[PDB]
Amino acid sequence: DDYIRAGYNHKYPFRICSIAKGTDLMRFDRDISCSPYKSNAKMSEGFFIIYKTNIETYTFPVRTYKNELTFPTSYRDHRTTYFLDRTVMGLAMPVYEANLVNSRAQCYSAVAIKRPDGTVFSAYHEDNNKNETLELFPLNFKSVTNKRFITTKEPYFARGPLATHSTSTSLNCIVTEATAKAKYPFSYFALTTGEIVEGSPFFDGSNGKHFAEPLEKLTILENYTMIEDLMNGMNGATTLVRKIAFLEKGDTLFSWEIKEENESVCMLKHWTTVTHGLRAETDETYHFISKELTAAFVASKESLNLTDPKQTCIKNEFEKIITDVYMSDYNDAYSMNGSYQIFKTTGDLILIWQPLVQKGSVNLRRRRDLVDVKSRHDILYVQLQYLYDTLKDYINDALGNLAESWCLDQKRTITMLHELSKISPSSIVSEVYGRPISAQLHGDVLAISKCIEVNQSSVQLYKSMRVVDAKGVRSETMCYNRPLVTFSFVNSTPEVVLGQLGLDNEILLGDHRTEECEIPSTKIFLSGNHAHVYTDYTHTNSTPIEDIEVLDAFIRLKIDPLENADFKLLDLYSPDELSRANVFDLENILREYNSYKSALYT
Amino acid sequence: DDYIRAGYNHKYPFRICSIAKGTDLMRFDRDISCSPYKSNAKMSEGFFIIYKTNIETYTFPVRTYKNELTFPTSYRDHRTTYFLDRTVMGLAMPVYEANLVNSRAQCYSAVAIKRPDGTVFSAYHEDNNKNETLELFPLNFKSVTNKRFITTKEPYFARGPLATHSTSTSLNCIVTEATAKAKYPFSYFALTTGEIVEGSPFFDGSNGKHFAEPLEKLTILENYTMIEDLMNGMNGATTLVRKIAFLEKGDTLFSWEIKEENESVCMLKHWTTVTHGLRAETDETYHFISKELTAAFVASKESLNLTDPKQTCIKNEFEKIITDVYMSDYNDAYSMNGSYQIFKTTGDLILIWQPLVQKGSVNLRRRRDLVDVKSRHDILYVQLQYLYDTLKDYINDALGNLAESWCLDQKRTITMLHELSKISPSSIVSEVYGRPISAQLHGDVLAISKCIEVNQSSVQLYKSMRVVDAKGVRSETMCYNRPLVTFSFVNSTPEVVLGQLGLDNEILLGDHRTEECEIPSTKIFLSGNHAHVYTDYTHTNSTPIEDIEVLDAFIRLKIDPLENADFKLLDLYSPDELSRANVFDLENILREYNSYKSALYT
Amino acid sequence: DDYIRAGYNHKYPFRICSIAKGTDLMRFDRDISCSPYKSNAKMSEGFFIIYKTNIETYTFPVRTYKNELTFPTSYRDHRTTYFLDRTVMGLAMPVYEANLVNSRAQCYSAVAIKRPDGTVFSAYHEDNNKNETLELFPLNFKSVTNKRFITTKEPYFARGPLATHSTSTSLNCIVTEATAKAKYPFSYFALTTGEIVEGSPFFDGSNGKHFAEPLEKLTILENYTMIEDLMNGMNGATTLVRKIAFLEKGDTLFSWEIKEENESVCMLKHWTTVTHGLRAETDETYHFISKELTAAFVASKESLNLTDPKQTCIKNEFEKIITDVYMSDYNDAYSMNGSYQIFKTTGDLILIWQPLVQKGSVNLRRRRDLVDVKSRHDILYVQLQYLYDTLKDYINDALGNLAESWCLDQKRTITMLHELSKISPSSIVSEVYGRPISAQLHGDVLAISKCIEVNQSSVQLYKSMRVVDAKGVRSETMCYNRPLVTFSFVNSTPEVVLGQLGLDNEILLGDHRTEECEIPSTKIFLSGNHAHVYTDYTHTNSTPIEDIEVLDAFIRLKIDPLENADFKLLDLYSPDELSRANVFDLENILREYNSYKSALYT
Ligand SMILES: *[C@@H]1O[C@H](CO)[C@@H](O)[C@H](O)[C@H]1NC(C)=O
Ligand SMILES: *[C@@H]1O[C@H](CO)[C@@H](O)[C@H](O)[C@H]1NC(C)=O
Ligand SMILES: *[C@@H]1O[C@H](CO)[C@@H](O)[C@H](O)[C@H]1NC(C)=O
Ligand SMILES: *[C@H]1O[C@H](CO)[C@@H](O)[C@H](O)[C@H]1NC(C)=O
Ligand SMILES: *[C@H]1O[C@H](CO)[C@@H](O)[C@H](O)[C@H]1NC(C)=O
Ligand SMILES: *[C@H]1O[C@H](CO)[C@@H](O)[C@H](O)[C@H]1NC(C)=O
């Protein structure tokens, strides 16, 4: 037989692509606009100041006056320990004696005791029966923050056992300087020692402030004069006080200066100042980004309006800070674009944003550093937000630039494809379309022709490319450039008609193409999945396409997907270590004391 | 001389590429499959509920009964302060008197005192010698959370100084309503005032619970009846108690209701409900992602099984929550795909995951918001995990889409290269191969030919492109399209043979190509690193290649690498500020009290 | 009329591109070097150990000795409660009695009382007038951590009421074993019960340590011998102590062993060991990355030098750890490259970095896990830094690989463009240049020609492509391949001259191109914005270009920008829950006690 059965390819099947109906003009869109990568983020330049809620307590000095009687303690004169001796109890210093102490740094020698009947008792030191004055001495060298002055060095006093205990001849006056503290509501204040006064330190006659102590014990004086410190004695400097309060609670008299709440307590404290900041406006919130702090603060778009008297105490301070910061760095290149705005970030931080306009060419640069010692991390969330914002911005910029470059490359490739289609329209148009078709250049546009398949049987190729005359004479000057192939159209039609092989398993009828024969020729034709070798315009061998190696024209993209990660929880200090880190434990102390007291039922 | 020495290029050297052996067929792989970008992550739809460990203490009401004798305090009748007067001490109220108080809101007028010998003492109010009853009054208007009822207003009592102190005629009954608290083990409970009972509040006759107090002091009653509040007096409503406990500790009697531990303490508390959640399954753990909370919870793949009686108290609650959530949002578009699963996330959070199936087309949408006030941040790790997961997902999606587009572009470029190789095979195949070679189209496949170099000396180009006859006659109708070049093969062979210049410093022997001459001609030929100008088919000038400018065909990728960042540590509040934020300091109070007591050695 | 008005395109306008001046040689740069993506990060291999500051207090045993007298408590013999009976007060045990207790586990039966006058009182148990010894008993079964031994079981003592109170005949000796704690400065130590000693536990005769207690009360002994535990009695084992301290404070005597501060307190505690670590060196700091912990530690580039005696206590431990870790995993594949370095990371963590060199081929692999219970998260910042570093590294690697692939693709595209320009130079050079120009291949280089526009009026196309002889005879063998177009040059010159249409609205004069006529012909020519159809070399129709569809040659990049995210603040436990989580509240206890004491003014 002078024919060879052809192979088969599942995506380049043997098809006849005659013009049939033709038409179906096509063209390449060379009119493509590529947009430069403009960032969609809206950013504004400026600086902002951050204020935090003040958690420090309000500390003020409190002076306490106490007068007490005590028998000689731990007496053991008689056989039965003289029944001991102890008066111990004391009473609050009277107001006039407090005035004497605050004026001349001395205290009276006599006290009055009121029995429930109403009788007034007169007690004297050593029974001298004199209402004279005694000086005060700084016992224990005034210690630290608890400077107390005393008039009696606690010596041995008069006593005598009548087989019992009966003695009280020791007058001592206790004057102590202490400091008190109060939380934010100021409903009460407590001394450092432990005494508690259930009332507002700013309470007055009609201020309406909280006060639970009995009113009759309270006493308010105006334009009072008192010595600053008792160490200096009666010659110490005296400062006028516009309003002072005297309270008699229990056995002690408490005195403190009544100040004004609005002018003495500020509930906002300056935390930090960011000289170079940016405001990123999202669809619902602002993002204040500080590269120096690596922090991003999120606040709602509605600016605040500071009106509370306890929150306007920072107005002058932050206005001066704004003026100084603007005068220092952004003096020339920028100008203050409108007034500042006050925002409340999530997490309750007061942020004062000041916009800046313009950009001059260059501006002064300043650097700073801090050596603060780490103790905790309460605001790591702003760092998390900053990390997300920075990574998102970088990724968006990189991918936008990549998209612009991709647009440019695609436009150039489209132009190149249009230029190439004028030479080999069929392959280019088939590749772009994605389906094997036939196209032909009809002037300046491509006129494709959808065409049908034929049956895969009876696909025979003549093993001679020579042109043979009608009289069975080979023409030595005419040789077919492509092998002659015979096909049976569809299987429903057993008729067989001869054609010529084209490209990518394509057949075409008509005048078979031919050219001058060449004595040396080793043409190879691809058909289906079997290469055919033609030497001297005749078939010699037929081998599978897989035998001839493949040029590695593909360019790989060495990118691997990111892997899942489980951030494991880390504990620097075990809770046992936190338990052992405190010298004093309230629960342990109370439990031990209660157990000892219960065992003390003897 | 009629010749010019050629230049040199280090990567396009003058080589002779005769066929020699030929062979070495090559082809382009146009059969490339481009996989679309399918995400490898496995995600499931549903909602989950998160439960946290309950840290709240167990609070229950405790009633205390106390009976005490006190002489008129701070007596000062006689000269020696009448040796004062103070009985002070007290004793626990007897059980029958407690019953009388709890029933008729009144207390007996007589008490019994047991001396160590065994004698029983009878003491009476005002020595009336009557065992009658007295009512209780809400002293201090019952205050807040410490409503205490008393029977004596502490008036002046009978006394008389025989130069000593001897008086005790004041019977007072103290009945107080207080609240106690206990940690999780319930080994003990302590009153708010400070009293401690070393026993389980759920202790019973044989429950086996921890109890350190002596058993003889304990007393357990059943079906006890008692008044709810003492403010209402004897007419107050009474509630039956199935089991009550009476404990006599020190000088006070404590009473509390014995409940059931399993039915009164729940160790898991509902935290939040996520209506729209996703479960990302990794190779070892599940990731529960909530976009609303911006949180990701990591739990092991093994579902739990709630069996502890103190942890099953949430079963009905969370089942009802599941039913309500499913009935509200996912009523129609989804159906409950199997039963729920319970997972324990890292960090000990109980997560109840409910799967959902299907997707109907649309579902109801609901929005919510919260105005909770920030105080701390204990679970920032879930936000960190969510941030990592979100960024990883976005990066993976973007790079997968980029890889798919790159595959498509590379496939089209390979097709274009195959089409181009049919016109200029040498350059295309050399570029793909990466090494300068020669190729020729042998029908439908390329037959490349590896070829060797020649010596770089004696590379001379004739300065005339005209074809000169054997008789020294220039042919005005035939002119060489390329300059004639002479080379000496390798330096080991000094013989010189004339050839014709090709492309990219390539030489070829044989019949030199020629065409019709043209009077106007300004052809320029590139050879080595020196362009040669040929006007009228003769050499005129020779200039370096760098003189002629270069088209900027390269398309840049404006991408810069990310920079290193050092997240600096931020401290909102200095540790000194934390120290100053507390009104009461245990260490300072104890140190001051101890110093004062040590100085009280008088 | 035999002419049709042409259309117009705003970017491909009708221009005449005659050679004019020519020149302007151009070429393609095929000499492009691409770079394999080499990472710029500098990483070193090794392992490091992390040490944290020790927050645990220093606990040591303290023995207390107390001797007290107490009358029979709660006496009620006589009618007036026998005026009660209470001596109660006590005194510090003398040093010699302490020696007797510490040696023979027994205490003397007599004590001495010194009155302020100077007299010495002799008191005895039951008035036996014997200075004998008594044993100690472990009261309350020694409890836990408060083992106390007593000699008196607190029985009834001798007493008698003479209408008053007079009795003291109960000698009791209190010996207690307690534990004390101290913070870092060691300025003071406090017992667990609550007693405070204002002095350094390491104080000595001349150590210079802080000590506020009076020196005369202190007593230091050397080579002291004492029983370890009092439970064993007089037969208990005794351990020599090189130095012991006896302090008499108040009514109690305190004894503790004086150790050496340098050899007993270590201020650095081992936290974790990272067997596989990496050190990333930035421009200013090192980054120590541990994949196992998912943590990155940032430290300055200057290595420390441990010299403090209280910080060198870890030297041997961490050197042994280094040796063991190297011997275990990196025994063969790696060698210790130099000595270790000590860094102080931000956050005050001591990091001991050990470099490793080489890589052998494979090394042993070991895995570990921990089941620690979560209680807090203090070091989340290292996890944040690790997350940033990991994401930055991955993004940099991916984008570098993408850049390298882009370089390769661009180089191949440039080669392809150079090959294509030899066929259709005008379109390729115009696309690369970005502006419509004309180019022509002058041998091996392109000689472009900048050319000017012409007026958009009088652009007429002849509706016949047939070549007509000068005698008005159509040539059936010659037909123009392109339509003949007439233009009026610029509008300032109304003269009209006929030309031939080219490509992309280009005109050219000279000998109009022509070829053999074909009976079937349906050529379509694009001009301006109107396609023209030519059948049988004559015009038939003119339609807009938008009518013919467009091949979708563009390849999209399905990438969408990342969206802004607001990480909302999450609170696991409300501050009210933190308030309710404590059984004991110092503020509430103090307020209630103070209110009760104030109401106790009776
Ligand atoms: C002094 O105080 C009185 C109120 O006690 C006040 O009325 C008066 O204006 C004050 N004068 C000065 C100078 O402060
Ligand atoms: C009442 O309490 C007793 C136990 O004291 C119990 O046996 C009885 O069943 C209870 N009856 C009711 C109705 O509660
Ligand atoms: C015993 O202690 C004394 C100091 O009291 C010291 O001088 C002596 O060297 C010590 N000897 C031994 C063996 O410890
Ligand atoms: C706040 O009050 C000021 C006047 O003190 C007013 O000018 C401003 O518009 C107010 N802003 C808001 C939000 O109420
Ligand atoms: C838990 O117990 C239940 C029965 O109460 C059983 O059905 C389930 O399989 C058990 N699961 C595990 C992990 O033990
Ligand atoms: C620290 O001291 C050691 C000697 O003990 C010395 O060798 C080293 O160079 C010193 N390093 C620094 C930073 O001072």
Numbering used by the authors:
A (entry chain A), B (entry chain B), C (entry chain C): 25 to 383, 391 to 633
Question: Could you pull the original sentences from the published paper?
Answer:
Human herpesvirus 6B (HHV-6B), a β-herpesvirus that significantly threatens immunocompromised individuals, currently lacks targeted antiviral therapies or vaccines. As gB not only mediates the essential membrane fusion step but also affects cellular tropism, it represents a promising target for blocking viral infection.
Specifically, the two fusion loops of HHV-6B gB, 102VGVV105 and 187WLY189, were replaced with 102HRTT105 and 187ATH189, respectively, in the final plasmid construct. Each protomer contains five intrachain disulfide bonds, with no interchain disulfide bonds present in the trimer. The DIII long α-helix of each protomer together establishes a central coiled coil of the trimeric gB, and at its apex, DIII folds back nearly 180°, which contributes to a six-helix arrangement at the apex. In our resolved structure, the HHV-6B gB N-terminus, starting shortly after the predicted signal peptide (residues 1–19), directly forms a short β-strand with residues 27YIR29 that contributes to the formation of DIV. In HHV-6B, the first β-strand is positioned on the outer edge of the DIV and interacts with the central region of DIV to create an antiparallel β-sheet. For our HHV-6B gB construct, which did not include mutations to prevent furin cleavage, we observed a relatively low proportion of cleaved protein, and the structure we resolved corresponds to the intact furin site. Our structural analysis of the HHV-6B gB 396RRRR|D400 furin site is consistent with previous hypotheses, showing that it is an exposed loop on the exterior of the gB trimer that does not interact with the main gB body.
